[PDB]
Amino acid sequence: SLTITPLSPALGAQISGVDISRDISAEERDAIEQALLQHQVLFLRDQPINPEQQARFAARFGDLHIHPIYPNVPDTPQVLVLDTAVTDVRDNAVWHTDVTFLPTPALGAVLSAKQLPAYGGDTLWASGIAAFEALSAPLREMLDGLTATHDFTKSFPLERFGTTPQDLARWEATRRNNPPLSHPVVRTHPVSGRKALFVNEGFTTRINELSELESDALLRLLFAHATRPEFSIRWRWQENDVAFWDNRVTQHFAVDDYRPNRRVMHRATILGDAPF
Amino acid sequence: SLTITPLSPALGAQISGVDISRDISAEERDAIEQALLQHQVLFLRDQPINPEQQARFAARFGDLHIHPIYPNVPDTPQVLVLDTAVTDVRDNAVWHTDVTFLPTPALGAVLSAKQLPAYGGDTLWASGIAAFEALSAPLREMLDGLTATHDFTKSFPLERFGTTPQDLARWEATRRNNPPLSHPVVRTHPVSGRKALFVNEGFTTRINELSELESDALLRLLFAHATRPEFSIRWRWQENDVAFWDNRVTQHFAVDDYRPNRRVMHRATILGDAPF
Amino acid sequence: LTITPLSPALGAQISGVDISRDISAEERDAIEQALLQHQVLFLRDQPINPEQQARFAARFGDLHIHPIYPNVPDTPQVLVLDTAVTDVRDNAVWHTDVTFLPTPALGAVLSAKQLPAYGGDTLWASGIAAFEALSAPLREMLDGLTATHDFTKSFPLERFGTTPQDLARWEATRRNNPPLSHPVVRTHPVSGRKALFVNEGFTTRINELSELESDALLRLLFAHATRPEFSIRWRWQENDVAFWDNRVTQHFAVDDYRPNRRVMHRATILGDAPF
Amino acid sequence: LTITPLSPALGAQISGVDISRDISAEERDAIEQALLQHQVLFLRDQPINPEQQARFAARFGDLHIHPIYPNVPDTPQVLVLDTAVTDVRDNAVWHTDVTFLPTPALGAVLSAKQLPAYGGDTLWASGIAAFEALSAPLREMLDGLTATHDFTKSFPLERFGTTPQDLARWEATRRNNPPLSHPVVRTHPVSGRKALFVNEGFTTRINELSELESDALLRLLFAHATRPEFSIRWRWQENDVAFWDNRVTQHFAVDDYRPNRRVMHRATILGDAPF
């Protein structure tokens, strides 16, 4: 009755037969967690939910993160209201792993679909575990143990189509407050111990132990490699979908093909520890 | 009642409310035809057909191709049987457009899913139309009028046919029969008039009017550009699925992650005219 | 006056004249005509002092008096580079001088005062030869496009900031020099010759292309424009004079002599707006 | 015997020994040592005839003889390279000589006879200097890997001709020199210095990497190994002699002089199996 149906060999699974708007049992919570450990990104369909519920469900998997930036519902502040009619989304022209420019990148996130365009707006996910596993032996050896700079500043969109309000000052603010830092290039999953590539085009600027030119060659290699179809899935949203993914060993990509159409999601972020 | 449900803005639509295991009505045929010209790749689920039903259907959209060299159904040799027990699948391991090395590459294909692995073996399509429209104007202006060389051997080197001196002669004949030839880089669809990128990593070796070095840069750019998520869809197959796509303005990619699991598809191929 | 070509693509050595003293109106014209043809001119065994250097450089254009570096007192018109005083982390990438300016230097006169035994070659490349070697369709696309030149490509300080004492001058030049644009294909204001006018040092973006398209084209242009066919390489020797047109060339200072020391005087000649 | 280094990476001008003579064991030893340090050696104003050039080249190994090429009648040990008789191309990609062979040439001795007034420079690049400049993680990964070298990378089918007598000579050479492998990091058989041993001319694949990875890596190595820091550019004059070590270098013939006549004489010294 609780059911896990894999979307592909590399990553992703749909879950059915457990109502996450209610309090879930420890057997359920565990099975879900094992699922997440295995398939890295998890989808539940036909699972309508509210902030309180969303917050409670997410909390069962890590301590939640209530933040200043972005929208927050009036009742629960630990659920962001991402709304097209308001905010903007030019932060996703490239593959991302979330907040890798933090010492302490999020463990993952739980995201519910509220209002969707007729179509468009897919999200892709890629597995750092599958992608790594597929590199040549010599290359896994060279990379495992190297480190990489992740830097918020790489997120700078500014005037591409010039949506940015005179307040590009929020952006400047976040910059001055989050200095570049480093994470392993090959990461070991804190819980499963499985190894994943942990560089993403969103924030990774440099492999520290290689020279600029080598770094640039290698990252160009690794960005294209990590995001090949073999290591990714593509989700077409439906309303009342819930996506639950492990941000420690995946990237994702929001396809921008639906503007000006309105899109409303609710996100709950689960705090993560130190990548190693 | 025949419904057409867009799968993504760039391309793709799912069709239902039509029974293609029988002979379809002028009206239906027409709506599908339009749907093809609009959405470029079409899908039907739960639409089991035998070789003959599949041939009757495909023939409603152009002349068929009886290839008398691969494993086809003896009774209706218009339908080719692609079984992983018997035949292999090396061909779809890279983004390609079907047989562009022919002066008259295939118009399109009808594909029917027999037996499948639980999951894995997705196929991706990409729109030459949407990719082209997405290039900036100066790049469109330069490429529109350039030609490119397509070469059968690029996807089928000597190593493909085998080691035997028998496979060698076989192969050297096929090559003698298909010298490298040229097509427009930007193809005008002969029915819709919509312009499309018409290079593919599977067979395009060279942009003719550019230097090797310039060509290499441009094709590496175009290949990446044209297979971006914004220009593609990804189909997860189920038994009795049917895919019908226009091979004049698309590309496709068969994810290789099911081996050794067995996979059987029936394909009928509709003959095309000279790209311009 | 003798003029002796060094490569089909660019560069010529000069002799039969002495430039430590004013030159005839015929000699100067002959030189300007050499500079316009050969793009970079060299003079061996031509000892000179800031005063004469200035006098010579000035007969080819208006001279510059800053330029964010240590200069000789008697002649503010002559910059003194000394690897003991001033490092050179900005010369070992191909660049065209001050393209981040609204109006980059016409070119410079450079004198060899003190040099290591060997090492520290300087390479020069021609945007005229480079451009003419591109295919017709590619010249047609590029000709008319523009590119962003950003002072902070050839620096970012090695991210030496946070450090404040010596870096405040960096964010100053940065604030004083926002990224601006130049045509990708420049028409030489005298000769009418067309040249590639992008350089890896400062050029960050082709404005009219997307970022991915720009990135591809720039990788291609940066490699193409510095192939052997379009460049020359000068082994320096004390008392040398290099005089180059910075409107249609790039140059590269090989960094292979550290920790050896090296001293040279520059007169930069002010330029006009690229088109 | 005087050895004047041209750059820290490689290259030295030699004098105090007339190599058109029968030289001493001692002078021959000093030359070999200079070659082992500098990788490429140059003599100016060294007229030499084919008999002498061979007698000199043989002092450093066995020599390659005659066919099916244009050697001087009495001297099958010296190849005569004339533009008037034989057209030359794709010496215009960077390459190491005959790396597709099991035992690529040790090196060559090259004499300049008749030169264009200018153009026709040759660049050399040090694979030792270039290896040492790679980051440790890269050196550690590359050192032990092997790569495929393939005659047909630079001599594709179309360089022979649609003529049936050309496809018989090329299929046989393609069958006579099928692709094979050398170490990516070569250990000089005499000095033990380690060097990158790939080159754009012949190297197709890093075997223990995937195609995709090989592609990105070779593209890095090719650009890197030919940077200005690890190369020199020789401007030829008549009666120059260049003598290079093909075990650890790459070279490039700028093609910018045609249709002007260039006549060179080359003796090739036979090499052994790279490890």
Swiss-Prot record, chains A, B:
Protein species of origin: Pseudomonas putida (strain ATCC 47054 / DSM 6125 / CFBP 8728 / NCIMB 11950 / KT2440)
EC number(s) recorded for this UniProt protein: 1.14.11.17
Source taxon at top rank: Bacteria
PANTHER family for this protein: ALPHA-KETOGLUTARATE-DEPENDENT SULFONATE DIOXYGENASE
GO cellular component, one term: cytoplasm
Record-given protein name: Alpha-ketoglutarate-dependent taurine dioxygenase
One Pfam family of this chain: TauD
Protein family: Belongs to the TfdA dioxygenase family.
UniProt-listed GO biological process terms: sulfur compound catabolic process
Transmembrane segments: none
